[PDB]
Structure formats: structure tokens, C-alpha cells
Amino acid sequence: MLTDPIADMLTRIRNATRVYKESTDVPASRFKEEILRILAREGFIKGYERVDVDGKPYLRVYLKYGPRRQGPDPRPEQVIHHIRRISKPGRRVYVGVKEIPRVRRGLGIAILSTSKGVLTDREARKLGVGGELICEVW
Amino acid sequence: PTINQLVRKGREKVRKKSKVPALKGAPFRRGVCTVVRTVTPKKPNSALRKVAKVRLTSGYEVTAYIPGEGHNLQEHSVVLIRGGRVKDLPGVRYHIVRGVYDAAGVKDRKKSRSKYGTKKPKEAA
RNA sequence: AGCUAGUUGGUGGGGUAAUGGCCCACCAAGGCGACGACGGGUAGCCGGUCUGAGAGGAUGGCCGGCCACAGGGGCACUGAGACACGGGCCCCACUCCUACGGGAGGCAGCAGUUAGGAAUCUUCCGCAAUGGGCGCAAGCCUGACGGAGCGACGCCGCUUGGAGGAAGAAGCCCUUCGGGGUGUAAACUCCUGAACCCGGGACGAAACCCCCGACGAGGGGACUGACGGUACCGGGGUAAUAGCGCCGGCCAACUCCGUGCCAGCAGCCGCGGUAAUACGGAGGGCGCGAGCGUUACCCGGAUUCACUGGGCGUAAAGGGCGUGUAGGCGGCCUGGGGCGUCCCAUGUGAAAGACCACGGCUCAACCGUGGGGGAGCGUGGGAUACGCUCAGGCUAGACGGUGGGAGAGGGUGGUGGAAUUCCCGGAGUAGCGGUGAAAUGCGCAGAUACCGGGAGGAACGCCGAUGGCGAAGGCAGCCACCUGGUCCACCCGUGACGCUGAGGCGCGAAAGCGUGGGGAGCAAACCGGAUUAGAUACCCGGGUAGUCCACGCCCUAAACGAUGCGCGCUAGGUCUCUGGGUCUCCUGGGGGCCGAAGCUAACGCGUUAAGCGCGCCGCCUGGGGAGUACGGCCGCAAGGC
RNA sequence: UUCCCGGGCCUUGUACACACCGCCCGUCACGCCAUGGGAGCGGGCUCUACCCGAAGUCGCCGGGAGCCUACGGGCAGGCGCCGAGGGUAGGGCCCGUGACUGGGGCGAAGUCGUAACAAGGUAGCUGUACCGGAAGGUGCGGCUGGA
Numbered sequence A: 001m002l003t004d005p006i007a008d009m010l011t012r013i014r015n016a017t018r019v020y021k022e023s024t025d026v027p028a029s030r031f032k033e034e035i036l037r038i039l040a041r042e043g044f045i046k047g048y049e050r051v052d053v054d055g056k057p058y059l060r061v062y063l064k065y066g067p068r069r070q071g072p073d074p075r076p077e078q079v080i081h082h083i084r085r086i087s088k089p090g091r092r093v094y095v096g097v098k099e100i101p102r103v104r105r106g107l108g109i110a111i112l113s114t115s116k117g118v119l120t121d122r123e124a125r126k127l128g129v130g131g132e133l134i135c136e137v138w
Numbered sequence B: 001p002t003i004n005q006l007v008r009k010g011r012e013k014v015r016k017k018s019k020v021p022a023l024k025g026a027p028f029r030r031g032v033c034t035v036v037r038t039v040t041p042k043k044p045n046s047a048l049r050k051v052a053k054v055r056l057t058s059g060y061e062v063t064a065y066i067p068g069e070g071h072n073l074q075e076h077s078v079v080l081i082r083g084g085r086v087k088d089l090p091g092v093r094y095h096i097v098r099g100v101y102d103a104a105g106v107k108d109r110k111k112s113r114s115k116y117g118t119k120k121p122k123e124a125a
Numbered sequence C: 001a002g003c004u005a006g007u008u009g010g011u012g013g014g015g016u017a018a019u020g021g022c023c024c025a026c027c028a029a030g031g032c033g034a035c036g037a038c039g040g041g042u043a044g045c046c047g048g049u050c051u052g053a054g055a056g057g058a059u060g061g062c063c064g065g066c067c068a069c070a071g072g073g074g075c076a077c078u079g080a081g082a083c084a085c086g087g088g089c090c091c092c093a094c095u096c097c098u099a100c101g102g103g104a105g106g107c108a109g110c111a112g113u114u115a116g117g118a119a120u121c122u123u124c125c126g127c128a129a130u131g132g133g134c135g136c137a138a139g140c141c142u143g144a145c146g147g148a149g150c151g152a153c154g155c156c157g158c159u160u161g162g163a164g165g166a167a168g169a170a171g172c173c174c175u176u177c178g179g180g181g182u183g184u185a186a187a188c189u190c191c192u193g194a195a196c197c198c199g200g201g202a203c204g205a206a207a208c209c210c211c212c213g214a215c216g217a218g219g220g221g222a223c224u225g226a227c228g229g230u231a232c233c234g235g236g237g238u239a240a241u242a243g244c245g246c247c248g249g250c251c252a253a254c255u256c257c258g259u260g261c262c263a264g265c266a267g268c269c270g271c272g273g274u275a276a277u278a279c280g281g282a283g284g285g286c287g288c289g290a291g292c293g294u295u296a297c298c299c300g301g302a303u304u305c306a307c308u309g310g311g312c313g314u315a316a317a318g319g320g321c322g323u324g325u326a327g328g329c330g331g332c333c334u335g336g337g338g339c340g341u342c343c344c345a346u347g348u349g350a351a352a353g354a355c356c357a358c359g360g361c362u363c364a365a366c367c368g369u370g371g372g373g374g375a376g377c378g379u380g381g382g383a384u385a386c387g388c389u390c391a392g393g394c395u396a397g398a399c400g401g402u403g404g405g406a407g408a409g410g411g412u413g414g415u416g417g418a419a420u421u422c423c424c425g426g427a428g429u430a431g432c433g434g435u436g437a438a439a440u441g442c443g444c445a446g447a448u449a450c451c452g453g454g455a456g457g458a459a460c461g462c463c464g465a466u467g468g469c470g471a472a473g474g475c476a477g478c479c480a481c482c483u484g485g486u487c488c489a490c491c492c493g494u495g496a497c498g499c500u501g502a503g504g505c506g507c508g509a510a511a512g513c514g515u516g517g518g519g520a521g522c523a524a525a526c527c528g529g530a531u532u533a534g535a536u537a538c539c540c541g542g543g544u545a546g547u548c549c550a551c552g553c554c555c556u557a558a559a560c561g562a563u564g565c566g567c568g569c570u571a572g573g574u575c576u577c578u579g580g581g582u583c584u585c586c587u588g589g590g591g592g593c594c595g596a597a598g599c600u601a602a603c604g605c606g607u608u609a610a611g612c613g614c615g616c617c618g619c620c621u622g623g624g625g626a627g628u629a630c631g632g633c634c635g636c637a638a639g640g641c
Numbered sequence D: 001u002u003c004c005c006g007g008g009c010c011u012u013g014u015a016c017a018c019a020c021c022g023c024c025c026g027u028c029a030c031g032c033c034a035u036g037g038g039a040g041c042g043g044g045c046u047c048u049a050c051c052c053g054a055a056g057u058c059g060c061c062g063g064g065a066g067c068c069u070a071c072g073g074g075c076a077g078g079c080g081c082c083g084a085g086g087g088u089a090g091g092g093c094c095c096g097u098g099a100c101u102g103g104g105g106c107g108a109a110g111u112c113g114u115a116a117c118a119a120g121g122u123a124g125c126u127g128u129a130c131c132g133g134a135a136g137g138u139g140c141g142g143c144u145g146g147a
């Protein structure tokens, strides 16, 4: 019955990226739409659009991959190596401004929901807020 | 388990078991002997090891191994119990301290004389 | 797993500095509890301390804060304050003096004795300092305190010399006897020089006091040290304590002799039974050094209670299955609030401790100063993405309508034939049964085989399938009735009604039990006959409960897919069952095989997950003792949880 | 080429690997350790009812009986409630102990048999019921952890 729409979306993307697909569909939410915007600016995907499927609004999330490499298993590298929901609906995780993770020692991104909108780990500490730690992506 | 179950049911603790009941965890506990005898070891080894049943001041009567080569222990000897077991001897989980009380240490033991209670040879040495 | 008599609440009093069932009358029947009441066991609590990468775990000795005690127990008095450690009264235990009737005493204050124990100190000095009490002051009291004494109990600092020195003494150890080692080590040469003798010898001390100014501000003067002749400084000055653990692997350090599963070692693996780096010694070496080891306990390793950070198909572990209460969790759009949540300042977070500096004791331990943030909670202000709530609204979730579809789904009642056994009649004879082979047994008293008639019970061949239905156990001749689940189509209705589910409740194979029927075949037990060393078995002949029915119990299993349910996502090839269609083919549900990606220790799984995610429940934490013991609940009992 | 012995390759199964001259099971016997039940015995803690009940607060009285400094009063004293505690009585929990008895565990070489591991010589396991010196056997039903 879709307990967690956002972990559903992140798992949608996690399964789409393992079989190297053009895009996959996820039902639309104004909050999901913000999270996909943040994934888009950082270069984890190529963008999105409010498509319509059977009178029901989904979101085509166009995937981005690495270059075709050589040797056995020429399947490319992922742009998203690891994406997982941190704060669960049964396990709420709330962080202040001084307690924010360093995702892959700066190389990754933490996405988290604050009173100043949906932000990243760098943007949250720039603005100085902290909030519900949505997910870590790299 | 789930976080809700861990809230409801919690996590248990190890709660160690005392391998030496020397009563208050005393490092040592004195008792008079009652029997000074020789016992045979377990399956893999073979000897006649020297043990003693000791009527502790804990109110316990326990066996105790008599280390070193040779002893001076009798039925009415007073002796200090140490702790630590002999694996080939079942029922012996505690050691006698030598050089403490009526029990004396090994004579002519000249290497590891901090153990087995032997005094320094003072022979320009 | 239930507790509750002042018990819960009220009214009016008593009482207190003061609220309050704190106590008392009268009234009402409440109060608490799985969010763990009540009860049992244990424990003084904290700042802090130990450990840890941290999250955590452990702990509360010194010191500071709080509490509670003062031989056991109770009570008041005085008083601002006590239920009063060195004040009072009473009861008991104990001790001491008694002229025997009635007195005295309370070291959990500083020392100290005794008992216990593995174990824990001086019946020291002084009010010079600080602090407390009384006092106008002088001063007096101060076992608070300042110090000293004892114990390597701990930490820190220092010494037992330094530099020279033989192709390398003696001793002793090993030797492939030539040599190698201890070893610059020592002997020996100088130089410095702990300890000890000698003189000086304090910081901690300046006030209280006195004079002036008025016993104010201010200036000046006087007395006073326990520690202690000690620290420290100067002069002189003698080479001057070293030990303990280990040397198989973890783990750094190897040979020789003795020994022979003996004596012995031991933390685990394990060594010792003739050539032992594992025992005993020696030589040598390694690790430390006024210590070194051992024991006992705490954290660590232990990510073996996993919040970080574990799992459950086969290793420990999915509840037998459903239903469902509490609880946990929950779709898309729009606003109100601003509880969760975030931010800002502010209040608090005592000191001490820890960290960062800078200093003080010749260094350090120790100590002083300054500084920095913690975390938690109060108040005020703000933010509204997510969670919550209130409200409006949506349809993908869910349920419902209409039209249908398959089925061993369930209960009741009825019925058909095949077969078995028995009874009757006919006909018919000398053997039939049975085994590996036999025997028991049945048979001339007319068997087995054949026919005809009759009774009775149980189970449904072919269909029938590696097939179907159900939540599970499970369900199979046919018929009728009553009845649940379920799948498809059409996108018509309500519209978030959702998922899971501790207890509860219901179903629950076989076997077993109770009461009453029925009993053809089969068949525990039991009896025979063989097989066998012996057979309480396997093989054969009989054969009772039971298997069948009704009603009531019983709750077990390899109740197995050894895989809980719900939803979302991630190649397909193929077989089969049942629906719909523009039925060549597509699509939906269901049952199978193979296999993308991915997962697994492998075996294997693979949209009928063991993949990738989320929600909820159950369970696991070495083998045995053990599903045993005790307690509890249930059962007629067996026994069950 | 069935059968007896030995050998060769493949494949299947194994709980064997000193390798089937293997391993393994349960009574029985001796010894020892911990332990359950047990006529009872001995304590500890606790609860309930009643009896006696000191000191002492409080409440009366303070009168045929005292004392007082201001007496329609105070003190002494008497009575009462509560009361530490002692006594009696019956329960609850816990601990030690008990003739005897049940099972468990250990003890290098004890007696009896062959249960399981290979189709273990009757496939095994299992719930249950009955039976047997012992493992175990058989009945009914289920499982693949077998053919």
C-alpha cells in the first residue's frame, strides 16, 4: 500500500540503474519532485518531466551512467553507486546543524528536509538549518 | 528485530558466571585441609596429581591442586587457596598457594621461584 | 498479574511556620495496573571515575553536592532550627560498680584494643596558617584543620657510575674440538661523585592589637611557626642496592644435560611413553626494572544482544493455521494551527574533574591562573519542507454494484455398483492356504474352485493428471438441499474506510479418552508356526481395542515449501489449469521446469525469490543436561503449554 | 559372468578418513560429582487477628486529697486513645537437611545384544498408542532429511 513513497522511489531508481534502462516511472509528489530536482542538479540523473500515464501523474526519471568500458563485463559504471533511505517511517532520523554526515568524505551527498525547503548537506550547513535526513546518495 | 520490537522487548545482557566461588571475590581464601591425596587425570594424560580438599573459611569444602614437586601438607594443615583450575583434574578449580601458611614452597626450585613459593638462594647468588 | 481500609474523592474540624487522608468525624464508591500495578531480590544517589573508535558498557573508593543513620526500636522536650552522634525519657541485648535496693555506659569523632578476614596506619605535634564558636577587646575552645610518623598501596622524579681497555684472562656453557659464547662485560687506568661530616638557614605572617586621623578612609609601629634546623644554599667528601617474568605456537628469546605418559607443565591448542627449543637444572637470550609476577573483579577484543552493528531454506531460529483487540505503521492535491522537528538570543548546566594554553614548586607527579564547547531542561522570537492535528478535495489503495466462470471448498439428507467376509441352496471332489523353502492353520463332519439367493459394514477402480479447491489441518462414486472462499469482464457506487497484529477467540492429520451405536476388511496388544546362537521382530496363520457414526474432550507432528503476512520495483524461454477480447494473438488469476541481473559459505533462489526496498508480528544467541525440574495454567487420563 | 575371491573405470550414497578389521546405540555392573522427588526435621523473612502494653503527645477530669507569684487559673495527680515491644494463633515465601528413590554427567582397555550411518542387511525420521532385558518392535498417520 506504499508505506514509504520516497524509499519506493529510491528503490525504483536503484533497480532501474542495475539493468541500464532509459527511464523508469514513479508517481508524482511535490516532495518527490523536489528530491528529484536535487538529484538532477548534482548530476545523478539527466532530469525529469511530469508525464501522464492513464490519467495518473508519474515522473520519467531519465538515468545517467558512465562510459562503456573494456574487458570482461563491458557494462558501464553507475553514476549512482549507492542510494538508500536514511530516515524511515518507523525509524525517524532528525539531525541538527552541527550533526550532519560527510558522505564519502565530502564526495557524496546527503539530502534532508528542513524549514528552508529540501536541501543538500552542503546547502543545509551553508544556510545553517538541519532537519529530517532523507537519504544519502553516491 | 524491528525498532518497535526492540522498544517493547529490549536487548538482554551477558551476565557472566563466576568460575571461582571464593565468596566476595576475595583474591585468596584460607581453609584447613581435610584430605591430602593423589588423583588420576582425565583421558588424554596420565599421572598421579596431588590435590587436597580444603575446609575454607567461606564454609565451603573444596578440592585444591598442590602444585610443584613435593609438598608438606597433612589433614590439619592450614593453607591459602588461590584460584585457577587444572584441566586434566575435574572438580579441582582452585590452586593452593605455596609459601603461604603451614604449606611451604618447593625446595631447590631455582628458576620460577616467584611462583611455587621458594626463597632466593643466597650463596653469593 | 492483579493490588487497594484512610483505600480514592468530598465536606467540616484537628494539626503544622505552612499545602496535603498528615490525623479525625460524616458522606460518596472510588483509586491503581501489561505504558508492568502489587510482590520478591538487590542497591545509598550525583558531579564524576574506568573502559571504549565511538555509540555503549561498567562503576559511585578519594574529593565536592544531596540523602539517610549514631548499639536495636520508639517518643517528645527545649529551640529560629533537632526528633538532637559526644542532650532527655522508656523497652530489649550487652558491659561495668554495688553495702543487692539501684546506679553507670553507647568510638559509623581522632588515635588505639579485640574479633572476623586475603587485607587496610600513629594511643604523634600544634593552634603559627585557614575555617568555626563565644567575646567590646584581651583571649579561650577547636583530633575541623595545618603538619609529621607507618605500608613500594598508587603515580612521578632520582641513584646503584662515566670514559677508556686484549683478535679478547680465569670461571662456566656449546663444539662438525679447529673454535664459538658470556664479552668492553669484568680485571685494570683515570674522571665525576649518591650517600655522609661541616656552616648558614627560611616563603608560608599579616592582620586581630597600638599611635595619628574620631576606635571610619588612610599612614606608621609592635607580637606571633607546629612543620623545624627541615627545605634550600655553600664547603668537604667515599664507586656506591638489583631484581622478577618468560623463551613450543598465540608471542620477542635456543642449545645442552637429566628424565622417560614418571616426576611434572598448563590460559587455549596441547606437551612428558629414550635422543624434549613445552618437564627439572645449567649456559645463553628476550621483556621490564624498584619493581616483577600471580590471584580476584570491570571494560575491551565480542560486529558472540548488533542504535551505529547480527541474523532465522539446509548451521541456533517463522508462530500449525486463520480471525481479530490493544499497539505499531500508512496513498495524491490544497490551506489553518505550529505539538513533533529546525533555527536565534536568553536562563540554567556549582566548584572540583577532563581538554586547550600560560605559569608554580630545580623536572615531573601535584598545584595555581585563564579559556573552550559540551549534552539535557526553562522562557521569549522566528521557519513550516517532512511527521501530527483540524478542514476542503482527489482517485491509483480498499470495499461495493451488474453480468458471469471453474472447483475432491464445507455441512446435512439420500442413493449406486464392483469387491471382501459370513449364512442358505445347488453342483462337485482330495486337497486348499501360505513361503525363500516350509510349517501353523483350514479340509471327506463335504474345504479350496463354480453357480444362484441373502445380510452387513467399509472405501469409491476407469475419469484421474507431474491436475483442481481451501487460511491451515485437509478434501475424490453420484444426487438434491443449505454454504463460504475465489477469478474475469464492465470502469458504473462510497471514497483513505489501509497493512500488520502482543493477549483474546475459532479451526486444527493421525493416534488417544468419555457415553452410546456399528463392526465386512484391516490390525497395536495377545496367542500360534517358522527363520535365528537367542526373536518379545522382519516372514506366515489367527486375533481384541482401534479404524466407521453421533455428541463431547484431547492441541501433538518432518502440522514441510523446514521459506509469516502486505505492497512496490527488477530479462525472459517454456508447460499446464481456468476467465475476457478486435479470441493468428493479446491480456488476467493460478499451478510447474529452465534460466537476465542480483543474492548465497556452498548447495540453490530467481516477478509462485532466498533479488532490490518499506511496515508489522514471531523467533534465534555454543553442544549436552532438556522440552527435563520447580512453580503456574489446562486436561477424565495420557499428557499439553 | 548369475554365484564365491580379487581387480579395473564410471556413477550414486555415507554420521567412515588410524578410512567397514570403520563407526555407532541402549539397558546392566563398580566408583565418583552435581541434582529432582521424599515420611518428615531445622531455620530466615514476611502477613493477618486478638491479648498484655512502658515512655510520651493529645483529649477529658483536677473531685469526699495536696501545692502555687495576681484563683470562673496553673502545676502535681487520676482516666482514656494511640503506642515501641512481648505473648498467643493461623497463613505465604525462601534456605538448609532427610531414610529411601528417579534421572543426569564423568571415569584409556567391564557384561549383553546390533538399533542408526551404504537399500546398514526390515529405508530412515516422526506425532501417538501398545509391548519388550536392552537398544528397540509393531499399529495408525505424516515427511524426503530414501529407493
Ligand SMILES: [Mg+2]
Binding pocket: C043
Ligand atoms: Mg544497602
Ligand SMILES: [Mg+2]
Binding pocket: none
Ligand atoms: Mg566495539
Ligand SMILES: [Mg+2]
Binding pocket: none
Ligand atoms: Mg569512604
Ligand SMILES: [Mg+2]
Binding pocket: C085, C086, C107
Ligand atoms: Mg561517640
Ligand SMILES: [Mg+2]
Binding pocket: none
Ligand atoms: Mg586474623
Ligand SMILES: [Mg+2]
Binding pocket: C127
Ligand atoms: Mg586558628
Ligand SMILES: [Mg+2]
Binding pocket: C205
Ligand atoms: Mg615570615
Ligand SMILES: [Mg+2]
Binding pocket: none
Ligand atoms: Mg618466535
Ligand SMILES: [Mg+2]
Binding pocket: B112
Ligand atoms: Mg615453567
Ligand SMILES: [Mg+2]
Binding pocket: none
Ligand atoms: Mg619508577
Ligand SMILES: [Mg+2]
Binding pocket: none
Ligand atoms: Mg559490545
Ligand SMILES: [Mg+2]
Binding pocket: B001, C306
Ligand atoms: Mg540492527
Ligand SMILES: [Mg+2]
Binding pocket: none
Ligand atoms: Mg509455515
Ligand SMILES: [Mg+2]
Binding pocket: none
Ligand atoms: Mg488480519
Ligand SMILES: [Mg+2]
Binding pocket: none
Ligand atoms: Mg500521511
Ligand SMILES: [Mg+2]
Binding pocket: none
Ligand atoms: Mg515548535
